[PDB]
UniProtKB/Swiss-Prot annotation:
Can form oligomers on macrophage phagosomal membranes. It is an enzyme of class 2 (transferase). Belongs to the TlyA family. This is 16S/23S rRNA (cytidine-2'-O)-methyltransferase TlyA. The lineage of its organism: Bacteria, Bacillati, Actinomycetota, Actinomycetes, Mycobacteriales. The keyword Protein biosynthesis does not apply. It catalyses: cytidine(1409) in 16S rRNA + S-adenosyl-L-methionine = 2'-O-methylcytidine(1409) in 16S rRNA + S-adenosyl-L-homocysteine + H(+); cytidine(1920) in 23S rRNA + S-adenosyl-L-methionine = 2'-O-methylcytidine(1920) in 23S rRNA + S-adenosyl-L-homocysteine + H(+). Acts as a host evasion factor, that significantly contributes to the pathogenesis of M.tuberculosis by modulating adaptive immune responses by inhibiting host-protective Th1 and Th17 cytokine responses as well as autophagy. Catalyzes the 2'-O-methylation at nucleotides C1409 in 16S rRNA and C1920 in 23S rRNA. Is likely involved in ribosomal biogenesis. Also exhibits hemolytic activity in vitro, by binding with and oligomerizing into host cell membranes.
Amino acid sequence: RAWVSRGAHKLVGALEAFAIAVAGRRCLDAGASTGGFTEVLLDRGAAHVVAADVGYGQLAWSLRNDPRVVVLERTNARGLTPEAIGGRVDLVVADLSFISLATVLPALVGCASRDADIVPLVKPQFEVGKGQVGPGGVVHDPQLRARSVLAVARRAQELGWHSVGVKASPLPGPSGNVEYFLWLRTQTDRALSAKGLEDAVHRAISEGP
Ligand SMILES: [Cl-]
């Protein structure tokens, strides 16, 4: 509940920062821990949302019963395919815990159309190496958070997916980690250059939540 509010607030921050249209589009929520992302997508006029159930907890039935929502069960983010979700989508969102986006990005890409937006939430606490998460489970070093974002961007680019924008999530995670949405597209004329991405990342880190 409180958690659904928090998820919804985060994704509105992302959609607005990036000017991504949702109306009439097919969407995938790659790790629906809360129905927050899903509710926002419905609210902003998605034609259809595939919500991948994480296997613990429970998405609200009222969400499951919505005619525009398919809850996909028994399948973590790396296992997702077009076949599994009923075809390629126009918008992919992911708020995943305890896993690096580098490992999941190939499946997410595999679920996306040519013309799609992919907007993962980069969580440095699950990207940095051992010894680098500080006291309280937070990545305190802003340069490490920046590198985290750049590493995911590099991984995406190896896959043909360019970085178009970065935006700090307006709420920190519950233990205090600042987390960052990265906007990825493969068909674009406004892809950030290396310097352009560095600038985008540095401003996002300096802004904060
Ligand atoms: Cl956190």
